[PDB]
Symmetry: D2
């Protein structure tokens, strides 16, 4: 129903959040050394 469209979209956004964290970690590595 609407709930499972919601679950698909929330899972996609969780994946996007993981990507954001990874990219911020690489920017930290560039800022340090």
């Amino acid at each position: 129903s609407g709930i499972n469209a919601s679950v698909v979209n929330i899972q996609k956004e969780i994946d996007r959040l993981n990507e954001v964290a990874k990219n911020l970690n690489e920017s930290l590595i560039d800022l340090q050394e």
Copy 2:
């Protein structure tokens, strides 16, 4: 100073991605309610 430049660009792109996440979660709320 080039690494600081690259950090500024990358952090801005990630801010844009966070805004995208927030907006998609908002219409996920619309799909959950009705």
Copy 3:
């Protein structure tokens, strides 16, 4: 309905947290640009 509301409130709370993260990252960005 009750549980739907519980999911809705929790996701809204996480949206507010994400907006806060965006604001703080923008402030660190402004500090990086003036340096």
Copy 4:
């Protein structure tokens, strides 16, 4: 350079916040599937 060190600390704090958000959204996903 102290501003760079402070930027590193603060961005790490926000990365931790983002991971916590991901965990809470996974918990809401588990509740939505039931």
